[PDB]
């Protein structure tokens, strides 16, 4: 097992496969409450399903790190946690609704 991942404050995760699987399952479960037509739901479901399929089909770590294209698997777990938190916040926010209101007539007109 490798030691001193290199990023200060980031600890080495033993058995990262189980942590990644649990985090991805929780992300999918939270996404299940978002309405179907929301683009966030389908996009994040596709990304998470791809990551879960790649993590379940590779027992190694270095090869899994190369395949995930994130590198340093611990920060991949960190990004999974960040995505889960964002998914919960987004379920709270509900940004799939239409626009709040149009801007004024020449709000974004440049020059002047």
């Amino acid at each position: 097992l490798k030691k001193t991942t290199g990023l200060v404050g980031l600890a080495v995760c033993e058995t990262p496969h189980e942590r990644l699987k649990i985090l991805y399952t929780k992300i999918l479960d939270v996404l299940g409450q978002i309405p179907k037509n929301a683009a966030y739901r389908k996009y994040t479901e596709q990304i998470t399903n791809e990551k879960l399929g790649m993590v379940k089909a590779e027992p190694d770590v270095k090869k899994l790190e190369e395949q995930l294209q994130g590198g340093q698997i611990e920060e991949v777990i960190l990004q999974a946690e960040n995505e889960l938190s964002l998914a919960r916040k987004m379920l709270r926010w509900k940004p799939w609704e239409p626009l709040v209101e149009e801007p004024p007539a020449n709000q974004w007109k440049w020059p002047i």
């Binding site: 389908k42 996009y43 596709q46 990304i47 294209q69 994130g70 590198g71 626009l99 149009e102």
Partner: protein, 97 residues
């Protein structure tokens, strides 16, 4: 420099290096303060023909930014702003200090 041999050996021993090999005071090895005239060649757009300005004017080739998804007006794979960076190589000249 104008230093005696014994002092030179003392300095080389105390520092641990050969001071006279690489001195920090400039001597006659520097260039002269009087130099021959230069010539300074002209640029690429100094032709006498086939040099119309409308073909080499960068400013007028600038255009207003393109607009996508103006609010006033399928698999659909997810995209990223750019492909993820490749991992850096470990500098196979002096990897560790």
């Amino acid at each position: 420099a104008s230093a005696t041999r014994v002092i030179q050996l003392l300095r080389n021993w105390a520092s641990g290096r050969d001071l006279q090999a690489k001195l920090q005071l400039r001597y006659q090895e520097i260039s002269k303060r009087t130099q021959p005239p230069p010539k300074l060649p002209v640029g690429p757009s100094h032709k006498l023909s086939n040099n119309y300005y409308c073909t080499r004017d960068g400013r007028r080739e600038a255009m207003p930014p393109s607009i996508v998804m103006s609010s006033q007006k399928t698999e659909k794979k997810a995209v990223t702003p750019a492909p993820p960076i490749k991992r850096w190589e470990l500098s196979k000249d002096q990897p560790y200090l």
